[PDB]
Amino acid sequence: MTEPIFMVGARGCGKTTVGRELARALGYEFVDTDIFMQHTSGMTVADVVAAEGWPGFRRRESEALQAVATPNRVVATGGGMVLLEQNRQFMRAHGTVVYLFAPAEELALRLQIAEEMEAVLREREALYQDVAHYVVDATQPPAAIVCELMQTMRLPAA
Amino acid sequence: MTEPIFMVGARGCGKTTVGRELARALGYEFVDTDIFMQHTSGMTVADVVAAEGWPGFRRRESEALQAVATPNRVVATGGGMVLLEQNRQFMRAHGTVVYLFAPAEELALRLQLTGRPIAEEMEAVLREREALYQDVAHYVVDATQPPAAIVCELMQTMRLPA
Ligand SMILES: Nc1ncnc2c1ncn2[C@@H]1O[C@H](COP(=O)(O)OP(=O)(O)O)[C@@H](O)[C@H]1O
Numbered sequence: 574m575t576e577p578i579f580m581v582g583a584r585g586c587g588k589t590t591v592g593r594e595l596a597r598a599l600g601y602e603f604v605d606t607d608i609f610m611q612h613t614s615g616m617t618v619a620d621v622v623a624a625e626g627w628p629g630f631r632r633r634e635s636e637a638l639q640a641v642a643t644p645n646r647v648v649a650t651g652g653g654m655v656l657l658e659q660n661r662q663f664m665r666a667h668g669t670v671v672y673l674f675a676p677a678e679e680l681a682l683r684l685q686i687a688e689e690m691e692a693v694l695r696e697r698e699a700l701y702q703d704v705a706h707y708v709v710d711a712t713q714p715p716a717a718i719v720c721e722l723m724q725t726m727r728l729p730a731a
Numbered sequence: 732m733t734e735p736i737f738m739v740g741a742r743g744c745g746k747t748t749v750g751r752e753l754a755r756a757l758g759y760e761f762v763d764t765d766i767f768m769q770h771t772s773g774m775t776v777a778d779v780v781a782a783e784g785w786p787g788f789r790r791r792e793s794e795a796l797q798a799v800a801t802p803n804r805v806v807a808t809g810g811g812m813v814l815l816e817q818n819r820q821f822m823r824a825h826g827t828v829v830y831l832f833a834p835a836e837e838l839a840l841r842l843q844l845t846g847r848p849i850a851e852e853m854e855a856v857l858r859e860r861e862a863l864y865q866d867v868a869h870y871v872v873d874a875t876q877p878p879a880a881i882v883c884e885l886m887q888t889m890r891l892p893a
């Protein structure tokens with residue numbers, strides 16, 4: 574089945590990468606709501622926040638979500654896409670949601686902050702769980718997660 | 732590990748397609764020996780054949796096989812690669828060999844050294860060369876599956892990237 578697949582998780586969990594790798598395996602399209610926002614508005618999140626604050630950033634993010642959602646597409650979402658209940662509902666409704674979970678220690682170690690990742694997870698862990706259909710060990714290699722997800726979700730390859 | 736992985740099997744078995752997906756999944760370089768040969772000589776098979784026939788192309792193919800067999804590389808090989816003993820000895824003694832198996836029917840459906848009905852040729856090719864694929868192969872996998880599944884299977888049976 575071809576419902577949109579939303580990858581959620583905190584900063585450092587490998588959403589874009591795994592998201593892009595899963596899309597390839599399934600023959601889907603791939604879109605990252607942070608990247609889309611940047612390359613369509615011209616603005617960074619610091620640009621958006623400085624001009625309209627976190628509330629205007631959050632609104633714009635919700636709008637991106639609705640804009641990019643479509644079948645045969647994997648969507649990587651920003652880390653705080655799960656703060657707004659309306660966003661959490663939209664994802665379970667339109668598609669299937671996958672949470673890439675990694676403990677703060679390991680989220681911190683990913684740098685291509687451990688106290689900040691710890692507090693992000695105190696706030697959001699529960700929202701990640703609430704919104705997810707499937708939860709997968711994000712500390713594996715991307716290819717391995719793609720494989721595990723095709724098995725768990727029962728998705729055929731391209 | 733890091734030793735060259737050789738993809739073998741007959742025309743239509745997916746060596747290039749599956750090889751690139753495997754490379755990509757491992758973060759490894761991919762090479763195809765037919766493409767390597769093209770670019771380092773400038774001659775298409777046809778140019779080579781014209782001058783030195785098929786025995787010539789085989790000679791240059793053997794050479795290329797030895798040129799491209801390096802670490803963290805997935806090497807896709809031409810069909811005929813396994814006819815020579817030297818090529819078989821080389822591959823097992825420098826890397827790990829994967830045989831992408833598929834039935835002749837299926838190899839002929841993929842159409843999208845010729846002779847007669849595609850299907851009948853491929854049947855005969857496979858009937859004689861199957862012992863050769865099996866001999867050289869370390870691992871054998873069902874190439875009728877889609878590429879990303881073949882990759883997943885191969886990563887589990889080969890214990891990669893582990
Ligand atoms: N696992 C597969 N499942 C379905 N089709 C495949 C698979 N692998 C390859 N194909 C298709 O089969 C044909 C064989 O392509 P190719 O990769 O060049 O094979 P080979 O290098 O063995 O000649 C192509 O049309 C390719 O797109």
Ligand SMILES: [Mg+2]
Pocket residue numbers: 576664665666667668669
């Ligand atoms: Mg749904």
Ligand SMILES: [Mg+2]
Pocket residue numbers: 702703704705706707
């Ligand atoms: Mg849940």
Ligand SMILES: [Mg+2]
Pocket residue numbers: 746747763765807808809
């Ligand atoms: Mg080929």
Ligand SMILES: [Mg+2]
Pocket residue numbers: 864865866867868869870
């Ligand atoms: Mg064998």
